[PDB]
Structures are given as C-alpha cells and as structure tokens.
Design a protein around this ligand. Sequence first.
Ligand SMILES: C[C@@H]1COCCN1c1cc(C2([S@](C)(=N)=O)CC2)nc(-c2cccc3[nH]ncc23)n1
Length: 137
Amino acid sequence: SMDDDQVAFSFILDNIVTQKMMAVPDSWPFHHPVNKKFVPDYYKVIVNPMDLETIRKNISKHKYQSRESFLDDVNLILANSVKYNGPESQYTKTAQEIVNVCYQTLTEYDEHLTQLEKDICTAKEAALEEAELESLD
Ligand SMILES: C[C@@H]1COCCN1c1cc(C2([S@](C)(=N)=O)CC2)nc(-c2cccc3[nH]ncc23)n1
C-alpha cells in the first residue's frame, strides 16, 4: 500500500532522528525551536529556522517523500548554526555531528529507503493519473 510505504519511510526517518541524531552528546540546542523569549534576536538572523522537533513533526505529517527532502531540513540545522554561531563554534561542531550521524544511518538504510522512495513516487504518480482520468468522467 502507499500508506504502508509512507508509514515505513516516515518511521525509519523518525528512528534516525530519535535514536541517532537526538542521542549526539550535547545536542540539546537543536532538539526544539529556539524560544524567542530566551534568544530575542535569533529570528532576526535566522530566516528559515529548523530543529529536530520540527523535523519529527514533519515526519508525522509525511512531509518527506525522499531522502533529499529530509536532508534539506537536516542540513538547515547545520547551516543555521553556521550563520548564527559561526563555522568554528562548538554549537556548529555539534550540529555537524548530528548531520554526520544522520548521513551514516541513512547510508545504513539506503537500500530500503531508496526502494520505499521509488514505490511512493510510482504510487503517487499513479494516484494522480487515476484522479485526473476520473475527474474527466
Ligand atoms: C542560540 C543557541 C545557539 O544556536 C543554536 C540554538 N541555541 C539555543 C537553543 C536553545 C533552545 S530553547 C531552550 N528552546 O530556546 C532549543 C534549546 N536555547 C538556547 C539558550 C536559551 C537561553 C539562554 C542561552 N544562553 N546560551 C544559549 C541559550 N540556545
């Protein structure tokens, strides 16, 4: 089923987030959105904020249909640390470790993830095609 494949894909991504990325030592700065009351200028500097909680929310909404779209937001966490904290900040070194363990685990699950990504794409194109043939009935 398309629902089954979306569920499996999202569960794999979520397990990467909770079991690997959130387990990086000292990764607390990236676990939740920055609180504007604690860091008032953060959102003056960071136009496209991202964090691991928001990624999990997106996973739960089946936002990610590909490894690439997932990694777009994962890399946003690192890029926002580079911008706000600097490329040599310990915050950025931590974000880099989060990104690297993400890559390592996606590599581990690449065969299954690639198959799910293709089958989701195929099913989606078929459902789109069928919806359109039906609309003209
Ligand atoms: C801005 C820094 C560096 O970039 C990554 C983000 N990071 C953060 C992130 C967070 C959050 S929170 C608690 N939900 O706002 C998400 C955990 N809090 C802080 C913070 C809060 C209050 C006083 C502070 N002094 N120093 C840092 C700090 N900093």
